[PDB]
Structure formats: C-alpha cells, structure tokens
C-alpha cells in the first residue's frame, strides 16, 4: 500500500479517490466541504483537517480542484513539498500549469506532472477512459503504475504545459459539438419530433463530419482555402438556422460563428472554405 | 428517345455537381444559371443552355432547383408562370416555412407535384452511394423520382410533410456549425502554439468519435428531462473560460461566445448543477440570440 494524498472531492475528485482505493493505496483526502469524504470513510480513507496536513501524509499528491485560482488559494499555506511529487489533474491554461509547477518547485517539490482527464467521472478507470499527461518522462514513468488506477494514460510531451494546451484544443471541439447539439435538439423537440429518433438519424452524419476533420487540418496547415463549400453559402445556411429557430420560438446559439463568417465575407474571403476561418482567429485577439 | 428529359435551375458549386451526376446517369439535361458561363463544362457533354428560367422549365417534365436561398428561388421563378405537367424537386437550403411557400407557389402555377430535398455532403461527394439526401413530400412523387435521384447518391424519404427535410436539414446543420466552430478554435490554438494540425487531427480522432457516441444518451436525457450527472455546467463554464484565457495567452481570437452566454444564464437561473441536457430548456422556452 503506497501512501497517496488527494486534494479535491468534487465529481471528478471522488471518482479519482474510488480508483486509487480500488488499486490498493493508503489514501488521505482534503476537500473544502469535508462531508464529500463520507462515502470514503468506510473504505479506510483518512480525512486531513487542512491542505498542509493532507500533503504531509504522503510522498505523492494528486490535485483535482475546479480551477487554477482555487489551486493557488488551496496551496497558499502548504509550505514544504520536499520529497513530494505533484500530479495536477485540474483543468486550466498552459501558463496556469507553468504557474503551479513554479509554486510547487519553490516549496521544494521533487517533480510536477499535469494531466487532463478526457471522460466524465463514471468512465474513470473503465476501458473507455483516457488521461493526457505532460511533464518529464522519468516523472511520468515513476507515476505510470499509480496512474493506471484511472485508466489509460497518454504521455503527450515532456513540456509541463502541453497536456493543458491539448486539453483546451479538444474542449474547444467538445464545446462546439455540444453548442450545435443543444441547438439541434431544441429545434427538433419544439417541432414535436422525438430527440432519440433524431439522434439515430443524426449519428451517421456526425461520424461523416469527424472523417472530414483531418482533410480540413491539412488544408489549414497548407493554407489551401479553395473548395466547393464557400463561406457565403455556409453563412446563408446558418442564417436559415436562426430563422427556423425564430419560426418555432426557440433560442439561437452559434452567434460567434455567424459573426466571424460575416466579417470573413467583408474581408473578401467569402469564396473560401471553413479552413479560411483559422487565419481570422490566429491574427487578432478578439471575442466574436 | 431513351434518356429522360430533366431541367436544372442553378449551376453553383452544388448545381454543377448535380448536373454532372444527372449527365453521368444518362439523362437529357437542360440548364439555366444567372451566370450562363457556369454551363461551359456541360456544353461538351451535350447539355442545352436555356435563355431564361421559363424556357428551361418548358424543356422537361422534371425540374431540379439548386439555388442559394428561398429569396433567390422566389426571384428566379418570378416569370415561370406555367408548371402544368411538371414535377418540382427543390434542393435549395431554407426554413420549414419557405418549403411550404415554394410548394404553394408551384401548386398555384399548376405543378403536378413538389418534393424538397437536403443534400448533406459537399459537391465532390455527390453521387457516392454513401452520400445521403433527405427527401420530404408525397411518397408517390418520391417513389416516381427515386431512380433519377439515385444519380446523386442514397435518398432517405423522411416524411410525407413537405417541410420536414428542411426541419431536419436545419437541425443537422446546427450540429455541423457547432463542430466546425469548435474545430476552427482548436486548430487556431494548436497552430499558433506551433503544433502540427495534421498530427493534432490524428490525436483528436478517437476523442471526437467518443463524443458522437455520447449524443444518443444526451438526447434520451433531454426527452426524459433528466439533468443530473457528474459534469455540472459551473465546471463546464470554468473550462470554456479557460479556452478564452488560453487563446488570449497565444494572441488568438475566441469563438463559442453563445455557449458561454447560455451557460452563464443557466448558472444564474440555479441550473449550475445540471448537465449539458439542462441547456435545451434554456432554448425551447424563449426566442433569443445568445
Ligand atoms: N466532471 C467532469 O466531467 C470532468 C471531466 C474532465 C475533467 N474535469 C476537471 O476536473 C476538475 C474538477 O472538476 P469536478 O467535476 O470535480 O468539479 P466539481 O464537482 O464542481 O468540483 C470542484 C472542486 O473544486 C472545489 N472548489 C471549488 N471552489 C472552491 C474554493 N473556492 N475553494 C476550495 N475549493 C473549491 C470543490 O470543493 P467543494 O466540494 O467544497 O465544493 C470541489 O472539490 C475540473 O478542473 C474539471 O475541468 C471534470
Ligand atoms: N457544400 C455545398 O456547396 C453545399 C452542401 C449542401 C447543400 N448545399 C446547398 O445547395 C444550395 C446551392 O449552394 P451552392 O454551393 O451551389 O452555392 P453557390 O456555389 O454560391 O451557388 C449559388 C447559386 O445560386 C445562384 N444565385 C445566387 N444569387 C442569385 C440571384 N440573386 N439571382 C439568381 N441566382 C442567384 C448562383 O448563380 P451565379 O452562378 O450566377 O452566381 C448559383 O447558381 C444552397 O442552398 C446550399 O445550402 C450546398
Ligand atoms: C469528457 C469530459 C466530459 C466533461 N467535459 C467538461 C467539459 C468542459 C468544457 C466543455 C464541455 C465539457 C470534460 C471532459 O473532457
Ligand atoms: C463546410 C465544410 C468545408 C470543408 N469541407 C471539407 C471537405 C470534406 C470532404 C470532401 C471535401 C471537402 C467540408 C465542409 O463541408
Ligand atoms: C457538408 C456540406 C457543406 C455545406 N454545408 C452548409 C453548412 C451550413 C452551416 C454550417 C456549416 C456548413 C452543408 C453541407 O452538408
Ligand atoms: C459534458 C457532458 C455532459 C453529459 N455527459 C454525458 C455522458 C456521457 C457518457 C457517460 C455519462 C454521461 C457527457 C458530458 O461530459
């Protein structure tokens, strides 16, 4: 039984706690709301009064909090991380990973690795589970056996910030897929159709879209914006989604997409493909 | 003689793809386009170019329309006053009510029948059996046009209701607009960070097919009004905010504004603990641009 500490017992933190218990370690936990540890006490888990007491109990510290800001608040009075390895599974930006790595190095930590869990809690540890890890290969290799408790890990880079970079890119795709899906189900539901029958009809079409993504990535890399689906036509179809929604009394998402396509047309990029939109983003810090 | 007579109105990206599919399947084609020069590649293959929309419709018993919009369709059919003995196949993207408006316009003018279709692939994939076109309108009219329409791929008759193909088109294109908004954001981030877009597409591929798998479960939750799970909107909104900050760190713009705005309002209305299924009632109960 290796000693492990866990900071954070939210939806994901409790899923992590159960995986670590199942795999046979001596777990110490801390959470702002100590009552979230109730389901772990029967399984032989120690609840530490403070973040400092939690970190003192183990050589390996797992963190799964809401955000970077909560992480820095929680680590404020954790003064001695000498001989400790930090595994940070908290979502944030590439620079926020560098900021926590620096905070823990300043306090004597042996090593920092960052992970992005890419499944909901119920899939953690199951065969469908993937976690992206970044940081020094020797530190990943040191932790690989512990980390197997939460499912498959993918070492994506020795650069501490890269798991968060890739996390933020993949969650952009997830955000967009869910924005389109919520809009779709709102339309079909208000129109009196069955959402589950709609999902069956849709799923072929959605897997076809996923097959197009690598061709689009190649066009973006190669700056090849010519094809058979110009932004003028795409924008006309997005405008018809708004009017379909208005006709039904349903609200309208995809506003940022309409605004960036509208400006692309004004810049004379109306004849380009969807690849044409990437340069609209890469050259200007703006919320569309 | 042998080959069926077919008229096509519109020779844009998709209209030209249709023209080539109809030629290849062995039909006798008459075309009209605002820009007559778009027919140059069809004239060798033996197609007739009509001077006006009316003369085009006069040449054939079956009329295919593939124009930009309803507004352009209405304008283009302004002087098409006689549709007696003509079946109308409208493949122009528009709203459910615009499909009803065109069906009524062509009835008034004596059309035999009207079906609406939504092509769900780019022009280069038209004619592949795997390319699906959704068709709505009278079953008998669809069944009589099924052999002609097999030129452009596999057709799926979704409803006798003329407006249904456009309803389902607008819903499927909502998903495509979302997917592409997220994909453009993702490629802007990884590109500006100096990563390879093509290796990122490969890394991403598993993760995106996993999401398609989650959609029927979410649809069930929305139908059953089950909004409780392990991925609360407060946590999802924090992650979306970190996409904005990641982008700002790279000097890159940010999309997904409507998604941040509707999740913020959910959190404000006490639905911060709910799953993504909890957003659907935010849309269904209020006409609003987020
Ligand atoms: N849930 C998922 O589906 C999912 C999937 C992939 C990744 N993740 C990532 O996992 C991380 C944790 O998310 P979660 O789903 O566990 O979120 P959650 O259920 O909302 O839990 C958030 C955690 O942060 C703590 N926290 C929030 N504000 C705090 C504060 N001001 N001070 C101290 N602690 C505070 C909470 O403590 P209390 O219990 O006291 O509120 C809880 O431990 C996030 O970075 C998220 O992006 C989640
Ligand atoms: N990937 C795709 O291209 C795709 C996929 C699925 C469905 N669709 C649907 O197919 C339809 C046709 O799109 P497309 O790709 O062919 O677009 P496109 O290449 O922009 O062509 C638009 C067509 O409409 C004509 N047009 C535009 N404004 C006009 C006006 N004011 N008066 C008369 N004609 C006018 C154009 O004539 P000119 O040639 O003279 O400009 C052209 O024939 C759309 O409803 C679209 O949503 C397209
Ligand atoms: C697959 C899981 C499911 C919850 N996701 C939370 C989330 C964050 C941002 C946008 C949508 C969903 C993180 C994941 O990667
Ligand atoms: C709207 C987007 C623009 C890029 N297209 C890429 C593509 C995919 C398959 C075949 C050709 C082009 C897919 C689309 O329809
Ligand atoms: C794949 C093709 C590309 C043009 N599409 C129009 C469109 C509309 C909204 C958002 C993106 C693309 C329809 C399609 O099925
Ligand atoms: C962020 C969204 C919220 C609904 N989730 C549905 C889901 C998918 C698989 C297993 C459980 C729940 C997927 C997500 O992660």
| Ligand lying nearest the CA atom of residue A211 | 4
Q: Between β-strands B113-119 and B132-136, what pairing exists: parallel, antiparallel or unpaired?
A: antiparallel
B93 and B228 both lie in a single domain:
no
Identify whether the C-beta of residue B49 lies closer than 8 Å to the C-beta of residue B31.
Answer: yes
Name every residue whose Cβ is closer than 8 Å to that of residue B18 and which is 6 or more positions away in sequence.
Answer: B8, B64, B66, B91, B126, B152
A151 and A222 both lie in a single domain:
no
- What are the phi and psi torsion angles at B49 (to 5°)? -100, 120
Q: Which tokens belong to A185?
A: 């189900």
Report which of A168, A285, A273 is spatially closest to residue A224, judged by C-alpha positions. A273
In a domain, A247, yes or no: yes
End-to-end Cα distance, chain A: 51
Report which of A20, A24, A25, A22 is spatially closest to residue A9, judged by C-alpha positions. A20
Count the helices and strands in chain A (H runs, E runs).
Answer: 11, 8
Q: Nearest C-alpha to atom 15 of ligand 4 is from which residue?
A: B122
Q: How far is the CA of A230 from the centre of ligand 2 (A)?
A: 9
Longest dimension (CA), chain B: 70
Q: What is the four-CA torsion angle of B81, B84, B85, B89, rounded to 10 degrees?
A: 40
Q: List the B48-49 sheet strands across, edge first.
A: B48-49, B28-32, B5-9, B62-65, B87-90, B113-119, B132-136, B154-159
Which residues form the domain of B254? 196-284
Report which of B134, B257, B211 is spatially closest to residue A253, judged by C-alpha positions. B257
| DSSP three-state, residue B227 | coil
A153 strand-pairing partners: A131
Name every residue whose Cβ is closer than 8 Å to that of residue B88 and which is 6 or more positions away in sequence.
Answer: B63, B65, B102, B106, B111, B113, B114, B115
Report which of A40, A43, A96, A107 is spatially closest to residue A65, judged by C-alpha positions. A96
Domain count for chain A:
2
A208 and A272 both lie in a single domain:
yes
Q: Nearest C-alpha to atom 1 of ligand 1 is from which residue?
A: B231
A135 and A28 both lie in a single domain:
yes
Pocket test for ligand 3, best of A16, A169, A171 (most atoms within 8 A of CB): A171
In a domain, B173, yes or no: no
Identify whether the C-beta of residue A27 lies closer than 8 Å to the C-beta of residue A38.
Answer: no
Residues of B within the annotated binding site for NADP(+)? Answer: 11, 13-14, 33-35, 38, 66-68, 75, 93, 230-231
| Spatial distance between the Cα atoms of B15 and B7, rounded to a whole number of angstroms | 11
Q: Which tokens belong to A132?
A: 């992206």
In a domain, B180, yes or no: no
The residue count of chain A comes to 288
B20 and B103 both lie in a single domain:
yes
Identify whether the C-beta of residue B33 lies closer than 8 Å to the C-beta of residue B43.
Answer: no
Residue with tokens 């006006």: B52
End-of-domain residue from the set A143, A160, A177 = A160
A54 and A141 both lie in a single domain:
yes
Crossing angle between the packed helical segments B257-268 and A162-190, to the nearest 10 degrees:
70
| Spatial distance between the Cα atoms of B117 and B167, rounded to a whole number of angstroms | 11
| DSSP three-state, residue A78 | coil
A68 and A203 both lie in a single domain:
no
- CATH number where B226 lies: 1.10.1040.10
A269 and A132 both lie in a single domain:
no
Between vectors from CA B11 to CA B8 and to CA B17, what angle results, nearest 5°?
Answer: 85
A101 and A227 both lie in a single domain:
no
- What are the phi and psi torsion angles at B9 (to 5°)? -110, 110
Q: Is B254 on the interface with A (CB under 8 A)?
A: yes
End-of-domain residue from the set A160, A181, A211 = A160
A3 strand-pairing partners: A26
A84 and A14 both lie in a single domain:
yes
In a domain, B236, yes or no: yes
In a domain, A113, yes or no: yes
In a domain, B176, yes or no: no
Q: How far is the CA of B150 from the centre of ligand 4 (A)?
A: 22
End-of-domain residue from the set B134, B161, B188 = B161
DSSP strands (E only) in A97-148: 111-117, 130-134
Distance from CA of B54 to the nearest CA of A (A): 25
What resolution in angstroms, rounded to 1 decimal?
1.5
DSSP strands (E only) in chain B: 5-9, 28-32, 48-49, 62-65, 87-90, 113-119, 132-136, 154-159
In a domain, B179, yes or no: no
Identify whether the C-beta of residue A131 lies closer than 8 Å to the C-beta of residue A164.
Answer: no
Q: List the A3-7 sheet strands across, edge first.
A: A46-47, A26-30, A3-7, A60-63, A85-88, A111-117, A130-134, A152-157
Q: Is A137 on the interface with B (CB under 8 A)?
A: no
- CATH number where B98 lies: 3.40.50.720
B11 and B148 both lie in a single domain:
yes
| DSSP three-state, residue B87 | strand
Q: Which tokens belong to A160?
A: 């501490």
Report which of A120, A19, A155, A167 is spatially closest to residue A6, judged by C-alpha positions. A19
In a domain, B168, yes or no: no
Helix (H) or strand (E) holding A153: strand A152-157
Count the helices and strands in chain B (H runs, E runs).
Answer: 11, 8
| Spatial distance between the Cα atoms of B83 and B62, rounded to a whole number of angstroms | 10
Q: Between β-strands B132-136 and A152-157, what pairing exists: parallel, antiparallel or unpaired?
A: unpaired
The residue count of chain B comes to 290
CB atoms within 10 A of CB B278: 24
| Spatial distance between the Cα atoms of A176 and A168, rounded to a whole number of angstroms | 12
B202 and B139 both lie in a single domain:
no
Does residue B120 have its Cβ closer than 6 Å to ligand 5? yes
């Amino acid at each position: 039984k290796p000693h492990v500490s866990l900071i954070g017992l939210g939806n994901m933190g409790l899923a992590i706690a159960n995986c670590l218990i199942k795999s046979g370690c001596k777990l110490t936990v801390w959470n702002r709301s100590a009552s979230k540890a109730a389901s772990l006490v029967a399984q032989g888990v120690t609840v530490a009064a403070t973040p400092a007491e939690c970190v003192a109990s183990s050589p390996t510290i797992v963190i799964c909090l809401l955000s970077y800001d909560v992480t820095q608040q929680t680590l404020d009075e954790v003064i001695d991380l000498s001989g400790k390895t930090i595994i940070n599974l908290t979502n944030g930006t590439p620079q926020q990973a560098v900021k926590v790595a620096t905070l823990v190095q300043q306090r004597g930590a042996e090593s920092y690795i960052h992970g992005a869990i890419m499944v909901p809690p119920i899939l953690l540890g199951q065969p469908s589970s993937v976690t992206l890890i970044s940081g020094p290969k020797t530190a990943y290799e040191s932790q690989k056996e512990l980390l197997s408790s939460i499912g498959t890990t993918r070492h994506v880079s020795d650069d501490i910030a890269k798991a968060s970079l890739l996390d933020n890119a993949l969650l952009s795709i997830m955000g967009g897929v869910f924005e389109g899906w919520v809009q779709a189900l709102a339309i079909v539901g208000k129109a009196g159709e069955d959402e589950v029958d709609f999902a069956a009809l849709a799923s072929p079409f959605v897997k076809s879209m996923a097959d197009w993504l690598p061709r689009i990535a190649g066009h973006v890399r190669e700056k090849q914006y010519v094809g058979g689906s110009p932004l003028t036509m795409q924008l006309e179809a997005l405008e018809n989604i708004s009017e379909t929604s208005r006709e039904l009394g349903v609200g309208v998402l995809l506003g940022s997409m309409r605004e960036v396509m509208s400006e692309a047309v004004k810049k004379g990029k109306g004849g380009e493909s969807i690849a044409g939109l990437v340069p609209m983003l890469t050259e200007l810090d703006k919320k569309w």
